[PDB]
Write an enzyme that holds these catalytic residues in place. Structure first.
Site, PDB file in Angstrom:
ATOM      1  N   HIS A  75       0.695  -1.329  -0.264  1.00  0.00           N
ATOM      2  CA  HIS A  75       0.138   0.029   0.000  1.00  0.00           C
ATOM      3  C   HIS A  75       0.821   1.219   0.036  1.00  0.00           C
ATOM      4  CE1 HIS A  75      -3.002  -2.777   1.251  1.00  0.00           C
ATOM      5  NE2 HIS A  75      -4.076  -2.029   0.972  1.00  0.00           N
ATOM      6  N   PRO A  76       0.383   2.183  -0.838  1.00  0.00           N
ATOM      7  CA  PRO A  76       1.180   3.455  -0.641  1.00  0.00           C
ATOM      8  C   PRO A  76       0.770   4.311   0.572  1.00  0.00           C
ATOM      9  CG  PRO A  76      -0.805   3.655  -2.170  1.00  0.00           C
ATOM     10  CD  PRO A  76      -0.513   2.343  -1.559  1.00  0.00           C
ATOM     11  N   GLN A 108      -7.631   8.799  -1.886  1.00  0.00           N
ATOM     12  CA  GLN A 108      -6.873   9.861  -1.134  1.00  0.00           C
ATOM     13  C   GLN A 108      -7.318  11.091  -1.324  1.00  0.00           C
ATOM     14  OE1 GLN A 108      -2.683   9.658  -0.214  1.00  0.00           O
ATOM     15  NE2 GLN A 108      -2.292   7.500  -0.941  1.00  0.00           N
ATOM     16  N   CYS A 138      -8.927   3.212   5.845  1.00  0.00           N
ATOM     17  CA  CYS A 138      -9.800   3.201   4.938  1.00  0.00           C
ATOM     18  C   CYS A 138     -10.230   4.661   4.539  1.00  0.00           C
ATOM     19  CB  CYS A 138     -11.293   2.426   5.118  1.00  0.00           C
ATOM     20  SG  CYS A 138     -12.453   2.259   3.757  1.00  0.00           S
ATOM     21  N   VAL A 144      -1.995   2.008   7.397  1.00  0.00           N
ATOM     22  CA  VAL A 144      -3.139   1.850   6.472  1.00  0.00           C
ATOM     23  C   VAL A 144      -4.640   2.077   6.946  1.00  0.00           C
ATOM     24  CG1 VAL A 144      -4.305   0.055   5.007  1.00  0.00           C
ATOM     25  CG2 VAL A 144      -1.862   0.211   4.946  1.00  0.00           C
ATOM     26  N   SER A 163      -6.491   4.222  -5.582  1.00  0.00           N
ATOM     27  CA  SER A 163      -5.776   4.992  -4.371  1.00  0.00           C
ATOM     28  C   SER A 163      -5.803   6.533  -4.734  1.00  0.00           C
ATOM     29  CB  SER A 163      -4.196   4.496  -4.361  1.00  0.00           C
ATOM     30  OG  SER A 163      -4.164   3.382  -3.561  1.00  0.00           O
ATOM     31  N   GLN A 164      -5.653   6.730  -5.813  1.00  0.00           N
ATOM     32  CA  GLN A 164      -5.817   8.306  -6.031  1.00  0.00           C
ATOM     33  C   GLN A 164      -7.114   8.851  -5.919  1.00  0.00           C
ATOM     34  OE1 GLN A 164      -3.216  10.712  -7.256  1.00  0.00           O
ATOM     35  NE2 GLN A 164      -4.975  12.100  -6.964  1.00  0.00           N
ATOM     36  N   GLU A 165      -8.297   8.188  -6.330  1.00  0.00           N
ATOM     37  CA  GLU A 165      -9.559   8.937  -5.926  1.00  0.00           C
ATOM     38  C   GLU A 165      -9.766   8.668  -4.564  1.00  0.00           C
ATOM     39  OE1 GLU A 165     -12.558   6.906  -8.611  1.00  0.00           O
ATOM     40  OE2 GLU A 165     -11.156   6.693 -10.060  1.00  0.00           O
TER      41      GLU A 165
HETATM   42  N1  LIG Z   1      -3.888   4.258   3.923  1.00  0.00           N
HETATM   43  C1  LIG Z   1      -3.144   4.035   3.064  1.00  0.00           C
HETATM   44  O1  LIG Z   1      -2.181   3.601   3.180  1.00  0.00           O
HETATM   45  N2  LIG Z   1      -3.527   4.136   1.884  1.00  0.00           N
HETATM   46  C2  LIG Z   1      -4.819   4.638   1.501  1.00  0.00           C
HETATM   47  N3  LIG Z   1      -5.964   4.241   2.010  1.00  0.00           N
HETATM   48  C3  LIG Z   1      -7.117   3.935   1.086  1.00  0.00           C
HETATM   49  O2  LIG Z   1      -8.213   3.379   1.544  1.00  0.00           O
HETATM   50  N4  LIG Z   1      -6.629   4.264  -0.171  1.00  0.00           N
HETATM   51  C4  LIG Z   1      -5.285   4.822  -0.013  1.00  0.00           C
HETATM   52  O3  LIG Z   1      -4.717   5.171  -0.970  1.00  0.00           O
END
Ligand SMILES: NC(=O)NC1=NC(=O)NC1=O
Ligand SMILES: NC(=O)NC1=NC(=O)NC1=O
Lengths: 164, 165
Positions: B66-67, B87, B121, B119, B83-85
């Site tokens: 995960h980014p 964030q 949601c 991480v 991920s873009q949408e």
């Molecule tokens: N929390 C993260 O590590 N990543 C982020 N959570 C998401 O739901 N989308 C993401 O890009």
């Protein structure tokens, strides 16, 4: 140098090693938990260990992340750099028209039978070896074929690791 | 329609569902073996069971795919579409220099402690909820934080799935 590797942030470890198993960065990301590593051989063993801990579906899943030999992704220039280099090495980029139709035919039959793509270590085989093995593995039972295919994945991984 | 999902070739199933767990098409690919699915819930259940079957290193590995919220990838514009949408909805795309730098520092502390990214949601959290969870979860033990993070991964997956729907 296993020492620079052992000092890598997980982000950098995943960037460097994230494609040693085609499109499965999770695998390399996982084995970073087992640092420090003794040598590249330790990393290889950890990866084999991880793959073998997966249910059969996980193994099949790994196979399904692989592109066909000489298939849509090759002919669309959408292979990863590793796959592209490996497939050229095995002659997949210079197949003639009849060879392409044949590979398509063989691939479709295989995937219909097994429910995952045909995977072989391309860097260890030439064109002829590839047709021979495809025709051969087509005759395997599913359980034996899954083991055969994962062994090719592990060979591909070992070569990819040693090219880093 | 689950009938249409159940009829997909694995190549098409992986193409459509390959990113419901971030950069882990293997999980989508794996679960196709268990078709036909009764319903969306059967799909989610198979995803959950697959993840639960992994060693702890696999679960960490998933998190490491995960980014970071507001991180190099967002700044470089190299996030996956989802991920873009996700964030952008959590306010990570309109941060000023101060906030971008502050997100970086919070993420640094977390990842140094736990050895995987923070991480959450993102579609269920605004920018203030994000900072708040980051600070509370920093206190968790590692054993507990792994389970907590994985639950968040499953939440993200569920909303990605419903967005496909
Ligand atoms: N929390 C993260 O590590 N990543 C982020 N959570 C998401 O739901 N989308 C993401 O890009
Ligand atoms: N055989 C495949 O399915 N894929 C090929 N084998 C490799 O080693 N690289 C590939 O692209």
């Amino acid at each position: 140098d296993i020492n620079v590797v052992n000092a890598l942030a997980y982000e950098d470890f995943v960037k460097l090693f994230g494609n040693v198993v085609e499109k499965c960065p999770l695998i390399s990301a996982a084995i970073w938990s087992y640092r420090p590593f003794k040598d590249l051989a330790d990393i290889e063993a950890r990866i084999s260990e991880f793959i073998h801990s997966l249910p059969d579906s996980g193994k099949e899943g790994i196979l399904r992340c692989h592109p066909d030999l000489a298939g849509r992704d090759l002919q669309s220039g959408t292979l990863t750099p590793e796959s592209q280099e490996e497939q050229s090495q095995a002659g997949m980029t210079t197949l003639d028209s009849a060879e392409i139709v044949h590979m398509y035919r063989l691939n479709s039959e295989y995937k219909e039978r097994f429910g995952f793509p045909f995977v072989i270590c391309a860097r260890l085989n030439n064109k002829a070896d590839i047709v021979r093995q495809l025709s051969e593995r087509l005759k395997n039972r599913r359980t034996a074929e899954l083991e055969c295919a994962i062994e090719e994945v592990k060979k591909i991984c070992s070569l990819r690791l040693h090219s880093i």
